[PDB]
């Protein structure tokens, strides 16, 4: 029974890896030869937003490319403006130990997930103007790692226990339990068409899922340690994942295999947050060492550094229109680079 | 100028928000955050009840000092993955059940847990207020059976004072560094009201440490 099923599972794994090797005819490094490199890229600190007073864990640009949402070690979730560095809203949340920042595409809701296995949805544009608790999503057994927004009605939440979830906003109950994983879950970034999203494993398993069906489609491996952050390519066909192995690894959804690794001998510190830029040419990835790095998705050759913080870059995000990128580290300051 | 009138009203709102943030941070820094931990089936609920989902935060003030107490032991996940979020706690209230010595074994599991926690890179300078529970039951069990079963290197006999001293020194020696931090131990039982007094004293000692560090008088 158990022996037969495990051995046929091993045979299936050998078959799938052999078939992947059959598909891998020429690597991306060989594919992109005689192409003009982007050259050295230097971006200065346009703004330093100093509202916060403690560690910054997450940050998410808005669809308008105008507002910033920044969690913090303290119970503050102060929402920022970019051009005029004001504090549009200051949210005094209750579960101070937060690690998520979700901004609704319509700009009406902002969500945060504390360490207490609770994802809290916050209303922004309401009568009697002040931020109010829209809903307190509960049902998980582990801490919420990252949260996104399908729309104002649905939210996808990664959790400490090995299960993601697609929630319902009106009724607190979750409609689909995404427990087809093993280990822990860290990152998730949806496609531009909001159809498929991936999962950031704690055991090097980037799992693509289907929002409507409710099961995996393509299981990915290739790292030797936990993978921390994931961000989709702007087409929504590929994504690169940043593990604790100091390696950025770029996948695809039509070969289910690696395209190229981003590992430098100098860097031993892992990736905390990764976020692509528009056209996906650049690959912005935060780092545990007090520095952030700029890569190229087609050629592993490294672009200019993005440094200036005093603590590890715990979050990173690029504007939807792509004008600029903001960096949030454990120093209270958040730097926006253009 | 060259700012709109509503833009100036918005910068006034931003200044008000910053002022509220400053007030909140000033009233939060003076608060003391004590990270509670422990081993499996520890008396964390008991020690919480003696004073006054995931985390169960505890609010209570003693001698004009609002304390933060966080029974994180009920999480059931990978510690080294979120324990970085707890950097900067004033102290780590450790919980070790004395009487569970004969019970892989609970004492050595807790010793490995303590070694990791005290030697974690995030808690390089945060003092640990170690607690030992059920002294009377531990004494009864030591009188019943010798402690040598748990400790193959034990050299003493079956007496309360020597057994307590042995386990205390064994736990204290576990620190790789002892100059940056300190380990405060209190043998506590069910009928020990002085626990809040010892917690207060240890918090005063550690906060004297922190203030002297901050002032640069070091």
């Amino acid at each position, epitope marked *: 029974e158990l022996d037969q099923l495990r051995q046929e599972a091993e045979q299936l794994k050998n078959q799938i890896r052999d078939a992947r090797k059959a598909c891998a005819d020429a690597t991306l490094s060989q594919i992109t030869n005689n192409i003009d490199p982007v050259g050295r890229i230097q971006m200065r600190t346009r703004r330093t937003l100093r509202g916060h007073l403690a560690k910054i864990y997450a940050m998410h640009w808005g669809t308008d490319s*105008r*507002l910033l949402v920044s969690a913090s070690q303290d119970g503050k979730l102060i929402i920022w*403006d970019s051009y*005029t560095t*004001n504090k*549009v*809203h200051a949210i005094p949340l209750r579960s101070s130990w937060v690690m998520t920042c979700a901004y609704a595409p319509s*700009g009406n809701y902002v969500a945060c997930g504390g360490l207490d296995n609770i994802c809290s949805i916050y209303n922004l*544009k309401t*009568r*009697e*103007g*002040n931020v109010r608790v829209s809903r307190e999503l509960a049902g998980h057994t582990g801490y919420l790692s990252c949260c996104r927004f399908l729309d104002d009605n649905q939210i996808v939440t990664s959790s400490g226990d090995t299960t993601c979830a697609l929630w319902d906003i009106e009724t607190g109950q979750q409609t689909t339990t995404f427990t087809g994983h093993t280990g822990d879950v860290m990152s998730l970034s949806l496609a531009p068409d909001t159809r498929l999203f991936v999962s950031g494993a704690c055991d090097a398993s980037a799992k693509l899922w289907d929002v409507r069906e409710g099961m995996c489609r393509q299981t990915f491996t290739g790292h030797e340690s936990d993978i921390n952050a994931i961000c989709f390519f702007p087409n929504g066909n590929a994504f690169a994942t940043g593990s604790d192995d100091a390696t950025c690894r770029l996948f695809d959804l039509r070969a289910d295999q690696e395209l190229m690794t981003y590992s430098h001998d100098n860097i031993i510190c892992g990736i905390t947050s990764v976020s692509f830029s528009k056209s996906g040419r650049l690959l912005l990835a935060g780092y545990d060492d007090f520095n952030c790095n700029v890569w190229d998705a087609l050629k592993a050759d490294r672009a200019g550094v993005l440094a200036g913080h005093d603590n590890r870059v715990s979050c990173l995000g690029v504007t939807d229109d792509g004008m600029a990128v903001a960096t949030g580290s454990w120093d209270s300051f958040l730097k926006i680079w253009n | 100028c*060259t700012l*709109s*009138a*509503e*833009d100036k*009203a*918005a910068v*006034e*709102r931003s*200044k*008000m928000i910053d002022r509220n943030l400053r007030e909140d941070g000033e009233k939060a820094a003076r608060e003391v955050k004590l990270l509670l931990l422990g081993a499996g089936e520890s008396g964390k609920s008991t020690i919480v009840k003696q004073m006054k989902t995931g985390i169960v935060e505890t609010h209570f003030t003693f001698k004009d000092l609002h304390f933060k107490m966080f029974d994180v032991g009920g999480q059931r996940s990978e510690r080294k993955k979120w324990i970085h979020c707890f950097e900067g706690v004033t102290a780590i209230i450790f919980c070790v059940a004395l009487s569970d010595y004969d019970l892989m074994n609970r004492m050595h599991e807790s010793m490995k847990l303590f070694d990791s926690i005290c030697n974690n890179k995030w808690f390089t300078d945060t003092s640990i207020i170690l607690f030992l529970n059920k002294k009377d039951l531990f004494e009864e069990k030591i009188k019943k059976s010798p402690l040598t079963i748990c400790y193959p290197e034990y050299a003493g006999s079956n007496t309360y004072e020597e057994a307590a001293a042995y386990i205390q020194c064994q736990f204290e020696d576990l620190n790789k560094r002892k100059d940056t931090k300190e380990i405060y131990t209190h043998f506590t039982c069910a009928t020990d009201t002085k626990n809040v007094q010892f917690v207060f004293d240890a918090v005063t000692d550690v906060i004297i440490k922190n203030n002297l560090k901050d002032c640069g008088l070091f």
Partner: single-chain antibody, 232 residues
């Protein structure tokens, strides 16, 4: 989110009276309140300004010095003390609440207010027509022209469109040109460039008839245009 005001009445000229408004059901402290007064047969004009935390206080040129306005956040009431009463002062005062931030809708709710009666360098808002005849179900366009360009460097115009009903307090329509407010149907729309502005109403319901209003917010006299009635 009701706003109710108290005080006022028949006062001998030159007297002193207290005009206070009560706020309930909404966060008073964050909001910056306003006072706008209307004569029985005249259009509205701005009077006073207060900010969150009482940091910033502004008055109209005519009412400068004579009035004093102070908000009490714990009391949840804003009160205005009234001095040197004249024939230009007799009117009905409107309680206005506004919040200023990116994407905000300032001047969105207006209280019922109370009436005060007595014995008896500013940019101009002009309206081409008043009491314009209109047919239900058609499209009507009303022009409000500003002497000063309202586009500013930020690229956003600052004309606010307000709608008044017979016997009803005004409500916000266009919190910034081509931006529609909450609780307002999609028929109303706004468009304009430079200084020449207009408000386009795709279809007219029986309820949405009355005097329309336009103002500015670049600078602080907060001028209003002479209202335009809509005639069936």
């Amino acid at each position: 989110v009701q706003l109710v005001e108290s005080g006022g009445g028949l006062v001998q000229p030159g007297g002193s009276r207290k005009l206070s408004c009560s706020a309930s059901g909404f966060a008073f402290s964050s909001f910056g309140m306003h006072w706008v007064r209307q004569a029985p047969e005249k259009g509205l004009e701005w009077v006073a300004y207060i900010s969150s935390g009482s940091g910033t206080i502004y008055y109209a040129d005519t009412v400068k010095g004579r009035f004093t306005i102070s908000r009490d956040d714990p009391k949840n009431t804003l009160f205005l003390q009234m001095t040197s009463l004249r024939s230009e002062d007799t009117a009905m005062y409107y309680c206005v609440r506004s919040i200023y931030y990116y994407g905000s809708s300032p001047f969105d709710f207006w209280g019922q207010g109370t009436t005060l009666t007595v014995s008896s360098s500013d940019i101009v808002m002009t309206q081409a027509t008043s009491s314009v005849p209109v047919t239900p179900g058609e499209s009507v366009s009303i022009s409000c022209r500003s002497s000063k360009s309202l586009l500013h460097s930020n690229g956003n115009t600052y004309l606010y469109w307000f709608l008044q009903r017979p016997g009803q307090s005004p409500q916000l329509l266009i919190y910034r040109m081509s931006n529609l407010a909450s609780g307002v149907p999609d028929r109303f729309s706004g468009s304009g460039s430079g200084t020449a502005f207009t408000l386009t109403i795709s279809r007219l319901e029986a309820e949405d008839v009355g005097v329309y209003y336009c103002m500015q917010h670049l600078e602080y006299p907060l001028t209003f245009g002479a209202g335009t009635k809509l005639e069936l």
